[PDB]
Amino acid sequence: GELSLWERFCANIIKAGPMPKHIAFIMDGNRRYAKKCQVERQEGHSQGFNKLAETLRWCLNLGILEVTVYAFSIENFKRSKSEVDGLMDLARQKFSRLMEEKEKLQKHGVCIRVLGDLHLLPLDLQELIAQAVQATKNYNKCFLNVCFAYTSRHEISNAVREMAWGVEQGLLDPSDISESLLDKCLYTNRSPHPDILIRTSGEVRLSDFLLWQTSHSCLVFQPVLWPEYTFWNLFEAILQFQMNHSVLQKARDMYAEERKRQQLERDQATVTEQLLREGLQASGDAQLRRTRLHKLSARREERVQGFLQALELKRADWLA
Amino acid sequence: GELSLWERFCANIIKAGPMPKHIAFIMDGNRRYAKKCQVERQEGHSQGFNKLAETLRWCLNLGILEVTVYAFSIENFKRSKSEVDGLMDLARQKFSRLMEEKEKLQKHGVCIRVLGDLHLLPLDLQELIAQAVQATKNYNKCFLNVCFAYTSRHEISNAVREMAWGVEQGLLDPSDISESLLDKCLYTNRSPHPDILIRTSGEVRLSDFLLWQTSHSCLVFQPVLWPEYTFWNLFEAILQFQMNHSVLQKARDMYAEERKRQQLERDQATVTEQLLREGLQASGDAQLRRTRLHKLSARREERVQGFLQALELKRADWLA
Amino acid sequence: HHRMRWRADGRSLEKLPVHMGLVITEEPSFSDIASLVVWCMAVGISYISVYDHQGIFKRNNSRLMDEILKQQQELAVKVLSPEDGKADIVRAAQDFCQLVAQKQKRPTDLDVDTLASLLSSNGCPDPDLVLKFGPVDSTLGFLPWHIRLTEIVSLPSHLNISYEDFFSALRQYAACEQRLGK
Amino acid sequence: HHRMRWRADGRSLEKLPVHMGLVITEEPSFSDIASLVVWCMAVGISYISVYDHQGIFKRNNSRLMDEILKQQQELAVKVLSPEDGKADIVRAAQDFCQLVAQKQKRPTDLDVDTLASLLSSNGCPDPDLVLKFGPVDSTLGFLPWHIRLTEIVSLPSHLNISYEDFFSALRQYAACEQRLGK
Ligand SMILES: CC(C)=CCC/C(C)=C\CC/C(C)=C/CC/C(C)=C/COP(=O)(O)OP(=O)(O)O
Ligand SMILES: CC(C)=CCC/C(C)=C\CC/C(C)=C/CC/C(C)=C/COP(=O)(O)OP(=O)(O)O
Ligand SMILES: C=C(C)CCSP(=O)(O)OP(=O)(O)O
Ligand SMILES: C=C(C)CCSP(=O)(O)OP(=O)(O)O
Numbered sequence A, B: 001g002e003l004s005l006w007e008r009f010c011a012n013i014i015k016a017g018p019m020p021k022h023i024a025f026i027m028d029g030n031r032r033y034a035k036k037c038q039v040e041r042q043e044g045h046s047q048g049f050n051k052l053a054e055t056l057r058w059c060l061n062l063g064i065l066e067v068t069v070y071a072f073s074i075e076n077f078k079r080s081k082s083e084v085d086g087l088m089d090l091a092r093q094k095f096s097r098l099m100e101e102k103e104k105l106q107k108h109g110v111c112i113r114v115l116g117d118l119h120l121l122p123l124d125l126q127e128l129i130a131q132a133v134q135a136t137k138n139y140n141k142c143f144l145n146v147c148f149a150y151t152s153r154h155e156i157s158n159a160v161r162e163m164a165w166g167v168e169q170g171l172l173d174p175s176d177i178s179e180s181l182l183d184k185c186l187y188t189n190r191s192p193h194p195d196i197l198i199r200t201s202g203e204v205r206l207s208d209f210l211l212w213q214t215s216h217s218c219l220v221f222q223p224v225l226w227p228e229y230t231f232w233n234l235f236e237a238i239l240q241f242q243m244n245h246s247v248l249q250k251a252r253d254m255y256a257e258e259r260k261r262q263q264l265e266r267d268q269a270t271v272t273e274q275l276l277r278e279g280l281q282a283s284g285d286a287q288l289r290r291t292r293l294h295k296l297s298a299r300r301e302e303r304v305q306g307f308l309q310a311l312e313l314k315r316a317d318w319l320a
Numbered sequence C, D: 001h002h003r004m005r006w007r008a009d010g011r012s013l014e015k016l017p018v019h020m021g022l023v024i025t026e027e028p029s030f031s032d033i034a035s036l037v038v039w040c041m042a043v044g045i046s047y048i049s050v051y052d053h054q055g056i057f058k059r060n061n062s063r064l065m066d067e068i069l070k071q072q073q074e075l076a077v078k079v080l081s082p083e084d085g086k087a088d089i090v091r092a093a094q095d096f097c098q099l100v101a102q103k104q105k106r107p108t109d110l111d112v113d114t115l116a117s118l119l120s121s122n123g124c125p126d127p128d129l130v131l132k133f134g135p136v137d138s139t140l141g142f143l144p145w146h147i148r149l150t151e152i153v154s155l156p157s158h159l160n161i162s163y164e165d166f167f168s169a170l171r172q173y174a175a176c177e178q179r180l181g182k
């Protein structure tokens, strides 16, 4: 699994620069590959899985300890039942060998998360995923996120439903809805946003993958077919990320400064409105506006922390 | 006029610390001194004038290049006509020897300002003061401010009248009235606020002197009678100022930070009010509140600079 | 005149974007992008959104319209900002959660379809094709909800963009195969 | 009880302040100044203003009143801030300049007397005597308009002020000769 002479060498050279902490993959091209190698479609998806395993060894060797992969889209439920069942049994086959290979998970501290609208999967596939996810919680050496029956819109809209659920239960006031609150309700709320997003084959589209989370991720479209993915593709991807890093860091940084600035700007407006309605003057040495602003944010942080605490509790799917 | 061995020495020691740029004197005790030395009241005021001349040589030697002195209060117009005429002829006598000693003024760059409600003085005394003040403008080696027919309340209320004059003429909107605008309309608007205020004899009151300007000046009450003022009184006064300087600097500094902070706090409230009335939302990426704040202050600075430019023009009393 | 020329150009491609987005990552030159937008209208693209992460075009909006009408002498345009993306998604959230608070809508009643009806783009199709100009390999916050299937074609600069350059990009999009998950 | 004792104390001085100000320059100890204020009432001072440059007493106002009523078990109080000084003078300016703008008052109509009628202290006499506690030799912004004739007596700390200490200060003010310019 360890890298060769050249791979070890180039790794050492880029590791001297900014490395990505989190890489996201759209493993695309499995069927086209199968047509080139004249193997059935299922063998292309099997070979596609082998590559997902190898490239994780590459990231683990490069220090990239968080990886998100697009494994099955809700849109893919429109394929042939032959193809789809073929995919479903492949997921059954691999999620089963994961428990046969337990303890090795405990040895390497590999945490497995499966994100998406998993209620659409076969009940047995759900039970397998659940056992795998639960058995691997409290592991922190490295993290794999597997997006199964996922689209970003379904994740984003679910993230707003959980916040409306909080509104509905008294946990949350609609003025509390914020960008970061939505961030903490996505399936990926445990991970940081990907530094890089990688889509294989010639496609220059995102196909409903982490649209929210990759708004400032560095986008890499490589023409290679996913079953053909080599270390140097992954390398070139990182190479592109380092070249964009300065630009993306400040763009990312100044997006956050502007939103915080606007947050305050929008916040102090209402505190002005409340004082104007109360008639209590805008600014004063008693620093009422100053003190009433610390009250607004503190009472908001309290409600949000209380909202999140319950969500993660409800997110406990011991049965699942 | 130059300092003695010990005076030179102690001067050098304090000059290693923070020195005051501006000292203000309430020359009090002239009559009590005259009663002790059994000389007529006029001789006490003459001797009082000699001391004002000597102590200025001390400040000029100590590098204190700005001095304000309380020479005649509006309240003093209630004394006997003998006393008051005695004072008035002393001012005539000295303001006349100032023009006899012109060119020496031009040599030492001494600028003379006479502050107060000078319309109450005898017409001839006014003409003398005016000639002296005009002849000494454009001098900048050192500045003497002589408060003749002055009380702080009469100066403060006059300072508000000039601003209402500006309101009345379209130069100024009543929302433009500010602490610093009032600062630029006082008689002393050419000088900085005194670092030290010195009142002689045992009195622990300010008797309507620079109340506005000395709100953070270091107050020194020395029991010496003003005609008896020695270098070491002035020294001790400075000594007290250095000991207070750290405390007074931050108190002075944090007063200005809080007022600026409240200024913005009070300013952005109205910009919130205007946007709320216009319905244009509080904060936005178009940064309307940000851009409309730069418009409010800039259009205020313009009106104020235009107000001040006319005031200093009207303040031109070539005839006087 | 030369309008029929550009009509037959756009009409000749296997596919033409119904909604096109222009992402400028690079000060931007109003004269250049004001002529990119009129090209889209001439060839037959219905909607053009122009975007930038620093919000330069949204501030200097009218100045960009003047350059657009000026170059229309040589002859449905939104100017977006980061506000148009995540901020608008968080706006629709607050609009829906208060319907949930009014006991009018249920939290379970929001789906992918209804949330789309709730965004500011409820009066436009999603961008079929995005032209990204500049050195940045990111969308930089362009309409994250809406770019789920958009084709993302990059060009090194809008610095002096030629018609051939712009039209070479439309040829790439015309040749793109949208499988839509099937 | 001991109330007649303090009545005869204040009654025995040649002069007693009608309005007394307490300037704290030094965290300040509420228990201590809350007992300075009740001393003034017991001896017969009508108005007591307490002041501090950091505005601590104006913020923790109610907490100071609680300490005052508590020590009244051992038996007309304003808590001021820098706002009370220059800021209020600049408030009255804006009030008058708009009367001038309404063509109701003339700019020449404001004098020393009318400006005094316009300040927040229009319902109180000017402070006859100010007790300054702490190391600072400045008024630090205490009612600049109002202290034109006030006697300013300094004490090194309110840290554990005794009745004898406080009453020694009233004895100094009783002996002060206000000549009022004559
Ligand atoms: C190891 C863990 C935790 C889970 C296993 C994850 C699984 C079951 C599979 C991952 C590998 C795999 C089967 C990827 C295929 C997913 C997919 C639909 C890829 C799209 O490629 P295609 O669209 O089929 O090929 P074309 O683009 O040529 O049509
Ligand atoms: C040199 C220049 C530019 C101007 C001359 C300034 C003048 C005319 C005089 C300054 C010296 C002087 C006469 C000071 C006396 C002012 C005054 C009324 C002092 C108060 O002391 P008193 O109140 O009279 O003494 P008591 O306190 O004992 O009653
Ligand atoms: C499972 C994944 C890798 C996500 C779906 S990638 P997909 O082949 O569907 O890409 P499309 O051309 O949009 O269909
Ligand atoms: C001319 C001056 C030094 C200002 C007046 S000092 P004055 O003697 O009037 O002090 P008061 O005891 O208040 O009368």
Ligand SMILES: [Mg+2]
Binding pocket: A028, A029, A030
């Ligand atoms: Mg595919």
Ligand SMILES: [Mg+2]
Binding pocket: B028, B029, B030
């Ligand atoms: Mg006197």
